[PDB]
Design a binder for this molecule. Structure first.
Ligand SMILES: Cc1cc2nc3c(=O)[nH]c(=O)nc-3n(C[C@H](O)[C@H](O)[C@H](O)COP(=O)(O)OP(=O)(O)OC[C@H]3O[C@@H](n4cnc5c(N)ncnc54)[C@H](O)[C@@H]3O)c2cc1C
Ligand SMILES: Cc1cc2nc3c(=O)[nH]c(=O)nc-3n(C[C@H](O)[C@H](O)[C@H](O)COP(=O)(O)OP(=O)(O)OC[C@H]3O[C@@H](n4cnc5c(N)ncnc54)[C@H](O)[C@@H]3O)c2cc1C
Ligand SMILES: Cc1cc2nc3c(=O)[nH]c(=O)nc-3n(C[C@H](O)[C@H](O)[C@H](O)COP(=O)(O)OP(=O)(O)OC[C@H]3O[C@@H](n4cnc5c(N)ncnc54)[C@H](O)[C@@H]3O)c2cc1C
Ligand SMILES: Cc1cc2nc3c(=O)[nH]c(=O)nc-3n(C[C@H](O)[C@H](O)[C@H](O)COP(=O)(O)OP(=O)(O)OC[C@H]3O[C@@H](n4cnc5c(N)ncnc54)[C@H](O)[C@@H]3O)c2cc1C
Lengths: 430, 430, 430, 430
């Protein structure tokens, strides 16, 4: 076992850091004063443009597919550096990565060449979105006997017809509400959308992914694709993840990502398992920003006393707890993404490790930001410090990318209950 | 022993609830459109006006002093109901209460009659502020051999001259920055403010409290009293707690609250111990709003599954944990205020109980809000629910009113380290 | 609302302290030499004798039934003092009180007069046991479609015949394995014990409680009642709670406690709700002993340094956290038992409060003992301090008297999920 | 960056597992029948003899020094597997590794060759001990102005004379109270032991380490070396760590480990920093045994319900938290030991990483055992399961090898407060 970073991993860090410090630090003056989420997202477009120019979207796509992604550990180091400075734009890049993952993972090389083209060009501001989440919730989307996804699709001729609503998926409506450049829309196949999901058939066997582009939306009637709203978020105030309604929305058969059923559900689960692992890097960045701000403050401020506050044991204890949470978190992320890259390990081992990672890093990042605030004291509550923004941003992580309580813990639980469960297969082999 | 509420405690609660729902619910539509903190505080003036007409400012003063305060348990009940709905204006009421407290507690009936007069009238919108906190911190203000308070006072003729800065004290500038109707300014006596505090004298013997009114301010040169800034807060966005600088600010000797030294420190300690106990009620109201909103959601929503999510054990575990935190918090607050009202008990015992109460309720209220958010899941993160506001608001409580890490834990540690410490004296007697 | 203790409550405390210090402190010299659990329990008989002589068993029976119980708050005070010194014998008293409860609370005065008689006499060493728990578990005993209790009973002529096994019920075999003086055996009614519980039935409608005395056991064949074993416990090493098998055990119909079904389940639920509330006083006593030992150590020992260890913030922080856990725990126990006593409150309100109390106090007692050990440090790990015993004893509390995870949380969850659940009914009526 | 185990790491694991399962499982049948700590420890001798025969003591010594230690990752894997089964004898091996470390670390090949010889022979049952800890404590041994170590040494011609007492050091009295085969006795140099440590000299400049063998002890008068007692421990009930008194105890100058002062303090600090990282693997072993026992239980028992208990969300939540604690702990240990072996890294970077590791792994192991017990429920409390032993054993870890509260957190705080502290130097370099 080895924890040393290669020259390309150190360069990936230096590059990410330089981009964050020279480009992302300027985003706040653009977005900070806009009234609504969409406006804030739009104000972020020149920074995404720069990220594309710096190669950061091309770096979300594997080299075999014409991108420049070197590894998932490189990706982890990049995301930690970006999120330690500014989640604006950084969040857009990862949302796009998620949006691309089903195509990156699928088994059609002609689909990959066609739909990944804009994202490896190094030009423009192309957005992708994995459109899974819904107004009524998704924690129970695979539950045999329940209503399932309320976004359904039916084959009519040589096309599919989507009806229903999505809520929350990042970048889904694009910069201007005429659509992401690529959206992977996750649907439940229902030949008749009025009738409930058949409780005698496993929900996983009825999943289909349909690829929707700006062209697709332009080819439909205006009322077939409507953005009904844009949630105002506590933190990550510059992301877009709207309420979208498809009404009789036609999509050509060639845009069907794969065979409906277990293969499609598989692509989705895989994409979301990879995000589960990497989301820990974002939480680390946010929490690391809080720790470092509190640390510098505790090593330079006496708070009207005779020594720097880090010399009070209760202050150092908080800082120690923060530092520990960050160190364990990062190791767990690097373990997770490395596990995901291991061809030897069966999927359930990868999936359990990804779930653990998401659950731990996100929950623990919140504690880290709060302890940092408690250590700095009253000054952390004013907006001339970063903590108000970090507090709001950090609370997103346990909730999003599949919340810990409803999705990730239950995905991990299902794995642990299986008869052939091997708790240590990722470490000690099978 | 008994927890039944008297008819007048029940009436205080009905009155508080009616006030909250007829008046305080309208505040948000007024303060929400104001871009800066002072303006938000100013938009809140008509609601404080209504608070005064409803008798709520008069109820912060004991009956023997012309007020209508029935008891601290009545107060605890009122504060919980107000803060469960809207901390805007509610926070102003309690900040005024704290400003009044050094006067309420002092042994001079002439000062009490004079300076409490506007607060017991039922007219206007009179504000009071206890001005203790400073830019450089206050956790170490009584540390022997340290710099001490940087707001100092010196006697010159038949007046005192205040030099230095305060930061954070609620209401201290009034509605218009010409001053609170009553400010208790806490100073360190120093004949020559350019000289450090003398390291061989106990800081507590150099504390003075000087009463500064609007008239005091108007009797000084314009540049003798100035507001340098108004912090933009993460939550409690409608409160004012400015950065104030006194420069050669003259106060009559008749305005000195009491003899400088241990008597003055003692009045500040007592005031802040009473607030330590009652700040729990504010934390309970906020956390209670989060718990109730999560409870109703959990009972009303299936999240696309086969049953309401309260029926999931992980969801119920969060709700159970919130409920336990709230229940234990309320009990401890009522214990602490009843203990403060007990004439048979020594100060050290009351102080220890008040510290415990502040530490427990405020730390635990934060966990209550966060767990509530986790239970609700993603929808908790959007501002169509109340959680974004509650999370920002709840994080104030561990930090303010004497932070838990630097001030309240240290005060309690000091009492616990005394040779005659009796842990259980508030319960089982001495 | 009032927390002040009456003269009789203070006397109850004094009496309980004097008993624990002059009698219970001598127990260890006797049980300590005994190599198995039963023999340790037997070694404890002379101390239970003394407890009876001091009126402590009589104090577990209400005055209208010939006992001397003053109130549940008196009971809480007695238990805290007892368990602060020595859980040996204390645990027998409390287990007997649980065994008496179904008879104390039943609607048959003839059963009360006959079966409580030995317990109000003030003589001998009479034991009672509520025999509910089983080798296969009881967390799911009321699960519809589940196997239910494996101890069943059937009516044959003018008798009931019991088949199956119990495990864990305190005192159940008596001093000599010829039986407790009174055992309430909870059975599921089944005319054929080889047949699985009907999945269509509500399991609570099948419950019967049969009273079994030493004369009942003697009236049966010797192999109809056998003790198969006695668990060797991590702590509470002097308690007995054996593995008992009933094989065609005949009981007179006049020993049926009440109408089978909902009424019988209700008596058991009520007895265990009462124990849920009071078990916190035992947790508090154990945790309090750990806190006070650490506190005395922290204020007298420098650990080879220049100052008492309580002077170190990290140490003081552990002690503060223990103190707060103990203070909140006692308040919650007093609230719970006062709630149970309230004639005007509905059952589910009482039950919910009792569940909260059990969950909180027992979880938090464990943390209190462990934090106290960390504060004292390495010396806490050797048996010349009490912490090794306290750690083993405290870990009983979250697991016993209905475990928190499987029973108490799920009882509380069920009440919260009821359409008419009112969270603050025990405090703010309505 | 890589977590993959080499073939030799996998072989170390297999070999350690086979030794634990074939040899160590048999230990309990021998030590459980003995009446006190010493006897239990003595009953452990044949198992240590087997460990020596299987090369496990030789594997504590680096290959350059004639041992077989392959790497600290190898050692971590071995310790996790040993402590997962049986800490008896396992504890003796690690205590011997600690005892050897000051010699392994020193810069004197002639000392190394002489004193390490029995330990690399593969013969007998040689024991080492690092005798640091004392009756009065050691958390403040380096405190300037404090009393310091109460075990002192004075130079008398060509010999040193030791006065004072040790308490706790494992193996220090050997199998028979005639001494460990090698003890490294840490002393404070003092010409006159009746005089207090000079408050004007930095305690670390007065540290000496004297090597004491069985020959040294036999060459002194009988009353010069006395075992006064053997603590009865809550867990690890088969280790020896006696109370030793040196009275005018003569040691040859050629047995001095190095020049007294910073160099000697540095060997002690380094040895204890290496143990701090590795003790994590012991904590993991114990917690892993709890987790796996709870997991097997939860996957095979319904607890009288219809489904395996792991299907209940609150049970799964506990197992998930245990699993996460174990995964993060192991990563942190492997990171910490790999950091210690990195010659490019400054000592303070290694030290910080080792303290973090000790703090985290030992605190969290306790939580893991307790969670596992709560998940299993009542049955976990009886000695037919492993948990009573594991609970007592896991509580050792945060207290021993320098407790977290008094020692490790203070050592880490000291590093963090340094002006040139680089928090991430172990991951991203300097
Ligand atoms: C900034 C941001 C970016 C996002 N990016 C995307 C994106 O790119 N694509 C996309 O599709 N979505 C995205 N989301 C949404 C998010 O990934 C999912 O909606 C969310 O994580 C799922 O919500 P939830 O887990 O709370 O599930 P919900 O279904 O909303 O359930 C909510 C709560 O109900 C409870 N619950 C429900 N069922 C159970 C159960 N069976 N067991 C136990 N508890 C249960 C749990 O407490 C759960 O937390 C984004 C959201 C945000 C804020
Ligand atoms: C909405 C609001 C209302 C307020 N109302 C008032 C008011 O009416 N009047 C008023 O005067 N102020 C008021 N305040 C200010 C507040 O009461 C105090 O400034 C704040 O509670 C004290 O800050 P602190 O406890 O963080 O101490 P600081 O001195 O700022 O110390 C900050 C941190 O340093 C550490 N620290 C410092 N010294 C030590 C030590 N010796 N040991 C351990 N740790 C230490 C702790 O981590 C502490 O949290 C208000 C503030 C707000 C936001
Ligand atoms: C000293 C002592 C005295 C005792 N006194 C008595 C007495 O007087 N009378 C008596 O009858 N018993 C007595 N007991 C036994 C004890 O009250 C119960 O057996 C125990 O509290 C119930 O066990 P449990 O709660 O762990 O349930 P179990 O049925 O053993 O369940 C074990 C675990 O399975 C899980 N589980 C099972 N079902 C669910 C579910 N539906 N949801 C979630 N999790 C689940 C939980 O993690 C639970 O902890 C005593 C025991 C001791 C040690
Ligand atoms: C099985 C076992 C094996 C052991 N092996 C060895 C061995 O091989 N060699 C050896 O020498 N010892 C050994 N020990 C002993 C152990 O390493 C040390 O004595 C112990 O870890 C140090 O004790 P402590 O950390 O509790 O410090 P203590 O000095 O005993 O301090 C006790 C407590 O006081 C408080 N405290 C003291 N000073 C401060 C401070 N400055 N700041 C904050 N809090 C403070 C802390 O709460 C601390 O926990 C062993 C013990 C056991 C049980």
């Amino acid at each position: 076992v080895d924890f040393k970073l290669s020259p390309s991993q150190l360069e990936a860090r230096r590059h990410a850091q330089a981009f964050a410090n020279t480009v992302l630090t300027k985003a706040s003056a653009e977005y900070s004063t806009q009234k609504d989420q969409l406006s804030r997202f739009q104000a972020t477009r020149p920074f995404y443009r720069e990220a594309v120019r710096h190669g950061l979207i091309k770096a979300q796509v594997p080299i075999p597919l014409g991108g420049t992604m070197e590894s998932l550990v490189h990706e982890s180091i990049i995301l930690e550096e970006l999120f330690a400075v500014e989640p604006a734009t950084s969040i857009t890049i990862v949302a796009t990565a998620l949006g691309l993952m089903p195509v990156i993972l699928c088994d059609s090389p002609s689909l990959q060449e066609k739909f990944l083209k804009p994202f490896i060009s190094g030009e423009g501001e192309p957005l992708a979105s994995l459109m899974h989440s819904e107004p009524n919730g998704t924690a129970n989307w695979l539950q045999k006997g329940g209503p399932g996804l309320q976004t359904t699709a039916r084959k009519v001729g040589n096309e599919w017809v989507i009806s229903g609503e999505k809520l929350w998926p990042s970048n889904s409506g694009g910069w201007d509400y005429k659509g992401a450049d690529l959206a992977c829309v996750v649907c439940r196949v229902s030949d008749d959308p009025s009738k409930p999901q058949d409780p005698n058939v496993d929900p996983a066997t009825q999943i289909a992914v349909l690829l929707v582009t700006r062209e697709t939306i332009a080819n439909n009637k205006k009322d077939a694709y409507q953005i009904l709203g844009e949630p105002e978020l506590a933190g990550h105030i510059t992301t877009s993840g709207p309420h979208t309604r498809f009404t009789e929305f036609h999509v050509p058969h060639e845009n069907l990502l794969c065979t409906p059923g277990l293969k499609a559900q598989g692509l989705v689960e895989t994409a979301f398992a990879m995000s589960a692992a990497l989301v820990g890097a974002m939480a680390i960045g946010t929490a690391r920003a809080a720790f470092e701000e509190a640390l510098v403050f505790a090593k330079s401020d006496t708070r009207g006393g005779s020594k720097h506050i880090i010399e009070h044991q209760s202050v150092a204890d908080k800082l120690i707890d923060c530092k520990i949470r960050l160190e364990t978190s990062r190791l767990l992320v690097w373990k997770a993404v490395t596990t995901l890259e291991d061809e030897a390990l069966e999927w359930k081992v990868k999936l359990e490790m990804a779930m653990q990672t998401k659950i731990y890093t996100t929950d623990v990042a919140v504690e880290c930001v709060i302890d940092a605030m408690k250590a700095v004291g009253m000054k952390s509550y004013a907006k001339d410090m970063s903590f108000p923004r970090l507090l709001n941003e950090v609370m997103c992580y346990p909730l999003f990318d599949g919340g810990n309580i409803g999705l990730r813990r239950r995905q991990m639980q299902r794995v642990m209950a299986l008869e052939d469960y091997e708790p240590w297969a990722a470490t000690y082999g099978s």
